[PDB]
């Protein structure tokens, strides 16, 4: 792996996560190895493969995403300041997630894998894409733990130790989690 | 005032959108107004009482430029920013913490949680770029709190802890946007 | 399905716009749809039979990102790209040729002719940026073929060959978007 | 010819073509010798001088062009997947050509030259402008020749040699061609 | 002409917006027209008589690309451009002066005063980028002159000189956009 | 003062002017010390503090400005090719000035200072902001003096010396001017 000459054939991602139940890849930047793809600069392509009876933990992305299910089927649930929407996607269905919206994913009761292409469109950091996770795992932890004790102890009106143990996870199975049942 | 009109006449600020015993938050958007609409910029006014905490939240898409017009502000800004740490852990996350004196500026980028405490009576001017359809998502308190919107067996797997336990803990916050400060 | 609605509900794909014994091409645009419209992104589905050829064409303005969802694809992408070869010949033209395995991506930039053969039954996912008012211009076959639209004495000077001869040769293609493969 | 200091006076193009019947120039890039013209970055200015009873061979540009006839008169013909439009431009007439559209030009039956300023607005390659020619000449040849034998032999259902001789030109008078009559 | 229509048909130029014994200025904008509207580009035609001066003015926001189609042009372009001279005086101002022969180009950026004299009968082609809502503000002459719009006690402090004196001097210009040249 | 590491806390401007009656500051560029604020690139933040019974001389900015009065009160007057508009701003009022518009400011009859935040949005020179002053002072002088004698002598139809003395100032109190009364 080094830089290049004039191309539009792009076959290699980077793994951001890989466990028991699935993968998280992200195609490299388009203008990265060429000034030829300058126009594709503000967008990123990720790949999402999950297994039967699995959940992607609740999170949000800094960018709007355009999710296309290329294989299988899933349960999409979007959270709102006052609510939730659930969507069933079977193969070939597509749907845009406004950025900032937190959502989780799930491949149903199955025998097959869900295969998802997420088209990310970037606005704050050009060509850059960030996912914020509510949970802690071994990789990165919960974004809520960045807060100082008092802050959290005040916003919540409970004592530190009681936040902690409803803060700080031991999510063995990091990002992807076989729905026990 | 001026019995002649229509143009970009001045504008100032009408009904706060959040307000209580610890603070108010005034906000005009490209939606609700003519001159911003083209700018696609929004604006807001922050008025909090000494020791009051504006619980963590984030703005879906606008980047908010925060000018401290008066008082002292304690600020907690988190995020990851650089995927140039392309293999997960690499771009571990950050806590940018600082107290802003009058005159100071701090930028708040779209998806970053942020919280602030008025270390003294506080008046902040806020200018948010990319302001169309921006929603504020609160992570604590009783209103607009997004966590609390997570289904019981969802929480169950998201957190160390139990569903009963998580409704529990979140219902423990009575206030809504602004909140009494006091530590330990 | 969900007896509750309106938003960005899911969407999938209705009547193909090109289809025959060798393949179909499904396409939704910012025009014909709500969620893409803002993205200004379009999408498409490619379904061709082993040995079938999608004759050369080009898209006026959208740049199409092509994901091979399954099968093998032979691809012929041409163009000049760099005027940084400012004195004509300098930026002579290119033939980027490659076969894409499942998983691979190839980008198709707006004015470049392209053609592809399914070396095996083929399913491609296509995401086109800058998709508003994009027209596909075909360079062979019987439908949407732009060449064939050139006046007899035009051809006469454009080509080695004669007008009679050029109508000739172009009428020799019976199919339209997809076409039997076989060489020599 | 080297780089610069602070200017907006631009008098020198680059010839992309120059023959018997006319010229093809292209003003250099605006931000090229200055960060002062950053805003003019996505656009290019070309110059087109043709002689009486001449044709610019059929082609298309990657960019939209805004064509203003500063001298003389011409016949503009735009080709569509199912058709053609012809336009007569006498001096001072202007008209935008959607990119991707293939078109040719002609200075009529005359005694004078046609003088044309093409305002190009770029979208794929910022500040970059590419014309695709159906014909072969000595400079570059026909874009159709980039295809491999079989490809062409299939799309056309005729044999290689019969494509060739209705492919591959000897356009002596390259881009510009005195309309015999 | 062509008894078939609607599209981007050709367009040329109708009633000048400034015209007199020394010159005319024709102008079509994204407002008043279909094809420019998307480009957001405007266009204009300059027709002045030898020795005529187009008094200093500026365009609020469009940057005007000026092609000399014929004759000789004397040009006075001023401005400061680089704040990379961040401490006032640093970026002192400039007078870019030049005569443009036929063929030459000069760019006119939005807020820069400019003036030009036809050193010989003159025909200029002008292409202005960012053309929506662009207003031309004249600094001399009798019409569209912005200075002259300054209140008497305003001038008083703005200038060396007096209010009486400034109305004075400005009323001394009888013409409007174009003006007799002659020196000393 | 040198470059940086990852921040969004910005507390230091640059003085463009500072006299008897007030200051003119300009926050440094956002992307200046970081690629992290790339998106804030086209905008600039200035600060304007003026004293009781003062005037900012008539001028125009190359950018549109969004002026927010954080302290006190002022008289805003915008000039048009055929006119003027006057606006009274008391604290908390905001208003956008189209670029190209020339305007002056004034803190009234008072005992207090006017404090103004100008949000500048840039279009010609990205991230760059230029104010054009009708008057001459010691710093820079009047933009009208850039013209050659004849030019001015013609546009005005008065003789050089009579322009001069209604051209060229001795604005002792440069940009800011205690309204005598």
Curated annotation (Swiss-Prot), chains A, D, F:
GO cellular component, as recorded: protein-containing complex
Disulfide bonds: none
Keywords, ordered alphabetically: Seed storage protein, Signal, Storage protein
Residues covered by the Cupin type-1 domain: 6-164
Sample GO molecular function, one term: identical protein binding
Subunit organization: Homotrimer.
Stated family: Belongs to the 7S seed storage protein family.
Function: Seed storage protein.
Name of the protein in its database record: Canavalin
Organism this protein belongs to: Canavalia ensiformis
Residues of the full protein shown: 44 to 224 of 445
């Amino acid at each position: 792996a080094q830089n290049n000459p004039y191309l539009f054939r792009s076959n290699k991602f980077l793994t951001l996560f890989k466990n028991q139940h699935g993968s998280l890849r992200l195609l490299q930047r388009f203008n990265e190895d060429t000034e030829k793809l300058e126009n594709l600069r503000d967008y990123r392509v990720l790949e999402y493969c999950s297994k039967p009876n699995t959940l992607l933990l609740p999170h949000h992305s800094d960018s709007d995403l355009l999710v296309l299910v290329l294989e299988g089927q899933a349960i999409l649930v979007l959270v709102n300041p006052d609510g939730r929407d659930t969507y069933k996607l079977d193969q070939g269905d597509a749907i845009k997630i406004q950025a900032g919206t937190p959502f989780y994913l799930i491949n149903p009761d199955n025998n097959q894998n869900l295969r998802i292409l997420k088209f990310a469109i970037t606005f704050r950091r050009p060509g850059t894409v960030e996912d914020f996770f509510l949970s802690s795992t071994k990789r990165l932890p919960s974004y809520l733990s960045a807060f100082s004790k008092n802050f959290l102890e005040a916003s919540y009106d409970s004592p530190y130790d009681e936040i902690e143990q409803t803060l700080l996870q031991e999510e063995q199975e990091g990002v992807i989690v076989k729905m026990p049942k | 005032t001026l019995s002649s009109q229509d143009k970009p006449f001045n504008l100032r600020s009408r009904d706060p959108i959040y307000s209580n015993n610890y603070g108010k938050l005034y906000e005009i958007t490209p939606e609700k107004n003519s001159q911003l609409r083209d700018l696609d910029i929004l604006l807001n006014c922050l008025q909090m009482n000494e020791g009051a905490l504006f619980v963590p939240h984030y703005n879906s898409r606008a980047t908010v430029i925060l000018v401290a017009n008066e008082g002292r502000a304690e600020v907690e800004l988190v995020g990851l920013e650089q995927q140039q740490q392309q293999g997960l852990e690499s771009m571990q996350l950050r806590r940018y913490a600082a107290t802003l004196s009058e005159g100071d500026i701090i930028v708040i980028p779209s998806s970053f949680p942020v919280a602030l405490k008025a270390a003294s009576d506080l008046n902040m001017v806020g200018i948010g770029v990319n302001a169309e359809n921006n929603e504020r998502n609160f992570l604590a308190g009783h209103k607009e709190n997004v966590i609390r919107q997570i289904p019981r067996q969802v929480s169950d797997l998201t957190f160390p802890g139990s569903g009963e336990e998580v409704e529990e803990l979140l219902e423990n916050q009575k206030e809504s946007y602004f909140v009494d400060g006091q530590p330990r």
